[PDB]
């Protein structure tokens, strides 16, 4: 197949910026390349076909260039509607393939996360399972690391993480990390700790509780 690769995965920009996104094909496709725009929860919309041709109704600040294997999507002056995920797609031959996407997100000032840790509820415990939740709230930029330590032993493979879209009002992210254990495992241990790093933090932030104490 023709592998499509996009760069960068994501980029942070402000209204008015000139933004460039790149797409590379394994083979030469020469100009059979489309660009699409997609907002969360909505169908994609075509911006450019034949790798240069603007599609009807698409504002003129969008342009595409390239031929062969290297292609470029340029937004000359970014508008608020343009914060979205962008896909390239080759229309040269079957199977039709898409690039992996480029998220264009809103730049803002750095905000370190506020960290909160929640013990399992007594009601859940009776059921036989313990979910311990760690919240990283209202941070920017997106990159962060959250580690679990149970009696100081680093956990692996027993947590899932989930992240919000950029907040509609302050452009921050929030993130949850959920550690799941059996009741029997949970009741062995005293100290449950969530350890967090972020480029806005001078040293890692740890939040913890002692199971069996208030």
């Amino acid at each position: 197949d023709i592998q499509m690769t996009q760069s960068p995965s994501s980029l942070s920009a402000s209204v008015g910026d000139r933004v460039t996104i790149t797409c590379r094909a394994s083979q030469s496709i020469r100009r059979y390349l489309n660009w699409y725009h997609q907002k969360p929860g909505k169908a994609p919309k075509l911006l450019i076909y034949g790798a240069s041709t603007l599609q009807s109704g698409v504002p003129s600040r969008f342009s595409g260039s390239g031929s062969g294997t290297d292609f470029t999507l340029t937004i000359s002056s970014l508008q608020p509607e343009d914060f979205a995920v962008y896909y390239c797609q080759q229309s040269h031959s079957a199977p039709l393939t898409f690039g992996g996407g480029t998220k264009v997100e809103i730049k803002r000032t750095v905000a370190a996360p506020s960290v909160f840790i929640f013990p399992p509820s007594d009601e859940q415990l009776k059921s036989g399972t313990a979910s311990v939740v760690c919240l990283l709230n209202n941070f920017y930029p997106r990159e962060a690391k959250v580690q679990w330590k149970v009696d100081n032993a680093l956990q692996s493979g027993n947590s899932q993480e989930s992240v919000t879209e950029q907040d509609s009002k302050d452009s921050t992210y929030s993130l949850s990390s959920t550690l799941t254990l059996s009741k029997a495992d949970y009741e062995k241990h005293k100290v449950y700790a969530c350890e967090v790093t972020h480029q806005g933090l001078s040293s890692p932030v740890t939040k913890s509780f002692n199971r069996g104490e208030c």
């Binding site: 942070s12 730049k107 750095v110 930029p141 690391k145 790093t197 972020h198 480029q199 933090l201």
Partner: protein
């Protein structure tokens, strides 16, 4: 790898200073570099980050518009250009590498600090 900040000094309000953080040893071009500052008796706080070239510069609220962080890979150095200095900018200023290539903020290596004082 070692770090050394220089360019601190005494300046009047409205004046400028150019900080530099030089890294002796391994090459830092693939790691983000961050500036922090610590005023007397206050917590150490974020100032700015220069990610890899092309990955963008990020700033704290307090210094947005006045400070510019930039890098010289050829010199293994990061710069903090501080314009429109305020008395509240008085602090010791530190640089740190983010040892994580993925930018999650693993600040293991720190410089010793350079003093910045803004006053009449």
């Amino acid at each position: 790898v070692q770090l050394q900040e220089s360019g601190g000094g005494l300046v009047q309000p409205g004046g400028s200073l150019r900080l530099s953080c030089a890294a002796s040893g391994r090459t830092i071009s693939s790691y983000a570099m961050s500036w922090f500052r610590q005023a007397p008796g206050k917590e150490r706080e974020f100032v700015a980050t220069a990610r890899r070239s092309g990955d963008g510069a990020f700033y704290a609220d307090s210094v947005q518009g006045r400070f510019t962080v930039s890098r010289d890979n050829a010199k293994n150095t990061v710069y903090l250009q501080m314009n429109s200095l305020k008395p509240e900018d008085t602090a010791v200023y530190y640089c740190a590498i983010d040892s994580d290539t993925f930018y999650s903020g693993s600040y293991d290596y720190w410089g010793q600090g350079t003093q910045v004082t803004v006053s009449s």
